[PDB]
Amino acid sequence: EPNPTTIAFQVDCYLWHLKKTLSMMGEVDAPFEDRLRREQKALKGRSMTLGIDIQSATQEGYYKIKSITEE
Amino acid sequence: EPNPTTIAFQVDCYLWHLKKTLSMMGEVDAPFEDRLRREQKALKGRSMTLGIDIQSATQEGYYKIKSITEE
Incomplete structure (x- = not known):
């Protein structure tokens, strides 16, 4: 089962995807897009540190948000 | 129609609501929560600066996100 660091990453990736x-x-x-660029670098970094692929994490984040929004 | 600054605010409010x-x-x-608290303060600030109420903006943000996710 996913730890809260993993869940935080998954959610962050998905939400970045929506903003993108x-x-x-x-x-x-433009300030929104600036924020988005800086966040993109931070999320790539975290991907490396956690050893979790962004595609996978984004999909998982989708499911987590789905679960809290159809509930 | 709302300009891109208003939309950026609405969306940021809604996504903050999901993270909270x-x-x-x-x-x-905990780092996700640190980020969340920092963001809460920034969003109160933007609420004052834009003269836009946070509850309403959060509602609008919900609709914008809904529209791009059932799309």
């Missing part, structure tokens, strides 16, 4: 999605739609401002 | 929800459930680690 909004950016690609042109829906958000 | 996870923290309240005891599911995330």
Whole structure:
């Protein structure tokens, strides 16, 4: 079962994915996108430190958020 | 229609609500919670600066995210 560091990573990856999605739609401002770029580097770093692939973590994060939002 | 700054705020508020929800459930680690507290203060600040109420913005953010995730 996933530890809270792992769950925190999964959730962070998924939420970054949503924010990136909004950016690609042109829906958000420049400071939002700045934050998104810095966060991208931090998340890549954490991926390396934790040894967890971002794709996998993003999918898992999707499920975690799903579980708290259909509940 | 809301400009990209307003949308960025709405979305940030909603996503913070999700992260706080996870923290309240005891599911995330302490650095995630540190980030969460820092973010809570930043978002109160942006609420004052933009003159936008946090509850309403959180509601709007919910709708924006919903729209891109059932898409």
